[PDB]
Amino acid sequence: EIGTGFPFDPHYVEVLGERMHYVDVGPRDGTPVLFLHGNPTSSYLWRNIIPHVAPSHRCIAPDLIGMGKSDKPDLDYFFDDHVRYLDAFIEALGLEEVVLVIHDWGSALGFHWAKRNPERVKGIACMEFIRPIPTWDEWPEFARETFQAFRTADVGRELIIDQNAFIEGALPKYVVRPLTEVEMDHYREPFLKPVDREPLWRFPNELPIAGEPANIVALVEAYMNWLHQSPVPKLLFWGTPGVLIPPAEAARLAESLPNCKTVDIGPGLHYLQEDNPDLIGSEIARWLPALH
Ligand SMILES: [Cl-]
Ligand SMILES: [Cl-]
Ligand SMILES: [Cl-]
Ligand SMILES: [Cl-]
Ligand SMILES: [Mg+2]
Ligand SMILES: [Mg+2]
């Protein structure tokens, strides 16, 4: 069975007046591997991947502001909020060079950080990452009505805030295998209080779909252009049918992105880490020393 435990000691750092939680395991020095979750997850998402990497490399996995075990400031939780807190987290830990391992909004954060700090990114492993979705036509049908409703005034907050639809609905609907109740309870814990679900609602409203919001579309286009022109080593995991990165997109990217390896994980929708963590972890571990 895929592991349900979270056997990592909590670490905390004060960031912009707020405490942020992170995992910090493996060697205490050397290039760290920075794992960035997205919506509506936490460092828990990486629990079965980190043990493959920690034998060789320091592993750092923060909980984004307002998520996981991190503090809950009264923010609007726009992408720019997350940018500010993650930038300040990285500086608070004194990180210099990093390897990024990124997913969903963690990928938007990671790629955006890399474009702005290109000399400090030694490699990027990514999966089910955020790219511009030019039309609803390209958003897979099985999840389209949901995300459209998430992005609709009043309806979206009833679903995500009042009814916890991101946790109880979208999350398990984006894993091919069934999540267990222990796993669901780990994902539920930060969000037992409805008001605390603001990040979960703002995130889908930030997705670059059909040209809006235009500032996020621009930001994401900018880092995708950066990624097409960067020689940084890249490792792209993909599943079938996928969500953000369908198989045909993964194959196009394998050709268009420089120095890119693609790994097929088999069945997968969005949270690929919950369907095939062993292959993702073992392949990252095999790939890291090649960043040499
Ligand atoms: Cl596992
Ligand atoms: Cl546990
Ligand atoms: Cl609203
Ligand atoms: Cl398959
Ligand atoms: Mg404070
Ligand atoms: Mg809207």
Show the 3-state SS of the chain: CCCCCCCCCCEEEEECCEEEEEEEECCCCCCCEEEECCCCCCHHHHCCCHHHHCCCCCEEEECCCCCCCCCCCCCCCCHHHHHHHHHHHHHHCCCCCEEEEEEHHHHHHHHHHHHHCHHHEEEEEEEEECCCECCHHHCCHHHHHHHHHHCCCCHHHHHHHHCCHHHHHHHHHCCCCCCCHHHHHHHHHHHCCHHHHHHHHHHHHHCCECCECHHHHHHHHHHHHHHHHCCCCEEEEEEEECCCCCHHHHHHHHHHCCCEEEEEEEEECCCHHHCCHHHHHHHHHHHHHHHC
Distance 244 CA to ligand 3 centre (A): 24
Q: 281, 48 in Cβ contact below 8 A?
A: yes
Neighbours of ion ligand 3 (CB under 5 A): 153, 157
Structure-block tokens of residue 214: 């235009």
CA 243 to chain centre: 14
Q: What are phi and psi of 135, to 5 degrees?
A: -140, 155
**Closest-lying ligand to the alpha carbon of 240?**
4
Q: How far is the CA of 38 from the centre of ligand 1 (A)?
A: 20
- Residue 211: left if φ>0, alpha if ψ -120 to 50, beta else—which one? left
Q: Give residue 225's region: left, alpha or beta (phi > 0; psi -120 to 50).
A: alpha
Show Cβ contacts of residue 261 under 8 Å, excluding neighbours closer than 6 positions. 233, 234, 235, 236, 287
Q: Which residues, by Cβ under 5 Å, contact ligand 2, an ion?
A: 5-6
What is the Cα–Cα distance from 147 to 157, expressed in whole angstroms? Answer: 12
Please give the distance, rounded to the nearest whole angstrom, from the Cα atom of residue 267 to the centre of ligand 4: 4
The experimental resolution of this structure, in angstroms, equals 1.2
Give the integer Cα–Cα distance in Å for 70 and 58.
Answer: 21
Nearest ligand by distance to the CA of 279: 1
Please count the structural domains in the chain. Answer: 1
List all residues 6 or more positions away from 61 whose beta carbon is below 8 Å from its beta carbon.
Answer: 22, 23, 34, 35, 36, 37, 43, 46, 50
Say if CB 180 and CB 188 are below 8 A apart. Answer: no
Active site residues: 104, 128, 270
Technique behind the model: X-ray
Query: Cα(125)–Cα(287) distance, rounded to whole angstroms?
Result: 9
- The CB-side HSE value for 73 (13 A sphere, CA atoms) comes to 16
**Greatest Cα pair distance in the chain:** 51
Residue 12 is part of which domain span?
1-292
The pocket of ion ligand 6, defined by CB under 5 A, consists of: 151
The rounded Å distance from CA 202 to ligand 3 centre is: 10
Q: Which residues contact 213 (CB under 8 A, 6 or more apart)?
A: 205, 206
| CB 52, CB 287: distance < 8 Å | no
Nearest bound ligand to the CA of residue 149: 6
Query: Which ligand gives the minimal distance to the CA of 189?
Result: 2
And the tokens for 56? Answer: 């060789």
CATH number for 170: 3.40.50.1820
Distance 150 CA to ligand 3 centre (A): 9
Distance 207 CA to ligand 6 centre (A): 10
Distance 241 CA to ligand 4 centre (A): 7
Q: Report the alpha-carbon distance of residue 265 to residue 276 in Å, rounded.
A: 6
